[PDB]
């Protein structure tokens, strides 16, 4: 089997991407944030504290003839950005772009933190990291991908995120029309439950390539590119007037600037992030200070190849017995 679904930016900055997901019988379509950095499929629901729902579409398990309470199961998750959610668990039928999993754990939120409430466009998350990170207790549950894997034509999914435009998540096949040149594959460590890999280096603008190993995670659920302070300083040094602002929470730059590109290495291959992809706009409405899309990972504890990086590539998440990651230009 295969599936193919369009993923759409939630706003004009590409702060996140939403993908429609069918849950239950009859189908209830929710728009979920596909997140290769976590492993829970959770939704706003009829069980979510009413004051914490503000415009989201909710899953109502009592209206699904295939929903079953997973007795005694609870979940609770905290994300890198400080947001969180928790609740109980149903199993139900879940379909993405024509690919159907029966018996998928659907984690129903009883509580969500303010950042979730405040984002009316995201109805929940669909985790695509390794199932070892799933938070359901006392019986850990599998991700949608893990459940689908054996049925797929090939045990892979691909992320093709757009810049200020829709893109595609495919399951079970590689669309050879969706990228240019060849796909370069690179090793993955699953030791921390992430799609963790090692970039071979970077360049800033038209500058020379610096060969250096940068361990990090391919994370569709993180907006920005978070890299070591040395790398980030070298980038922003090429932008007149750019500076790190403790008050704002990272590097800012004059909105009048033209940003240089940033290149990262995948083996001997190179992925070029255009400068415009690094512009996250005014820090507040009407400001001439703009927020940067490349930020320091210092104090995160891990480097994160988030959407800024991934949207410059066609990315293969190969879930073979020994997982790997592939990157192609597009």
211 half-sphere exposure, CB direction, 13 A CA radius: 3
Question: Which one of 14, 35, 123, 160 is the catalytic residue?
Answer: 35
Q: Which two tokens stand for residue 185?
A: 């594959």
- Laid out side by side, the sheet with 196-204 consists of 269-273, 262-266, 196-204, 210-218, 303-305, 225-227, 294-296
Q: Establish whether 199 is a catalytic residue.
A: yes
Question: Which one of 199, 261, 296, 297 is the catalytic residue?
Answer: 199
Q: Angle 99-30-293 (CA atoms, 0-180°, nearest 5)?
A: 95
User: Which residue in 47, 85, 54 sits closest to 69, CA to CA?
Assistant: 47
Q: Are 184 and 265 in contact (CB under 8 A)?
A: no
For residues 322 and 274, give the distance between their C-alpha atoms in angstroms, rounded to a whole number.
Answer: 32
DSSP per residue, 175-189? -TTSSSS-PEEEE-B
Cis, bond preceding 143 (omega within 30 deg of 0): no
For residues 53 and 30, give the distance between their C-alpha atoms in angstroms, rounded to a whole number.
Answer: 14
| Integer angstrom CA distances of residue 221 from 32, 259, 311 | 11, 24, 12
Q: What is the DSSP letter of 116?
A: H
Q: Establish whether 39 is a catalytic residue.
A: no
Q: Which two tokens stand for residue 278?
A: 């690094």
- What residues are annotated to the active site? 35, 199
């Amino acid at each position: 089997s295969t599936g193919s679904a369009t993923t759409t930016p939630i706003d004009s900055l590409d702060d996140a991407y939403i993908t429609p997901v069918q849950i239950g019988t009859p189908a209830q379509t929710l728009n979920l944030d596909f997140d290769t950095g976590s492993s829970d499929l959770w939704v706003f629901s009829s069980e979510t504290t009413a004051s914490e729902v503000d415009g989201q579409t909710i899953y109502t398990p009592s209206k699904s003839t295939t929903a079953k309470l997973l007795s005694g199961a609870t979940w609770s998750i905290s994300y890198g950005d400080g947001s969180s959610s928790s609740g109980d668990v149903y199993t139900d039928t879940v379909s993405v772009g024509g690919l159907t999993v029966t018996g998928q754990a659907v984690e129903s939120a009883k509580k969500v933190s303010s950042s979730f409430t405040e984002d009316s466009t995201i109805d929940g998350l669909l985790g695509l990291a390794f199932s070892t990170l799933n938070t359901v207790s006392p019986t850990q549950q599998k991700t949608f991908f893990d459940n689908a894997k054996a049925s797929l034509d090939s045990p892979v999914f691909t992320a093709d995120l757009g810049y200020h435009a829709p893109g595609t998540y495919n399951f079970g096949f590689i669309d050879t029309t969706a990228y240019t040149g060849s796909i370069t594959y690179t090793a993955v460590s699953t030791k921390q439950g992430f799609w963790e890999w090692t970039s071979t280096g970077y360049a800033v603008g038209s500058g020379t390539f610096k060969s250096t190993s940068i361990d990090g995670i391919a994370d569709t659920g993180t907006t920005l590119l978070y890299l070591p302070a040395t790398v980030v300083s070298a980038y922003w040094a090429q932008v007149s007037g750019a500076k790190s602002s403790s008050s704002v929470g990272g590097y800012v730059f004059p909105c009048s600037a033209t940003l240089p590109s940033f290149t990262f290495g995948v083996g001997s291959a190179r992925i070029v992030i255009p400068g415009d992809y690094i512009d996250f706009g005014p820090i507040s409405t009407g400001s001439s200070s703009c927020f940067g899309g490349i930020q320091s990972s210092a104090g995160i504890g891990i480097n994160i190849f988030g959407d800024v990086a991934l949207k410059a590539a066609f990315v293969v998440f190969n879930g073979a017995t020994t997982p790997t990651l592939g990157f192609a230009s597009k």
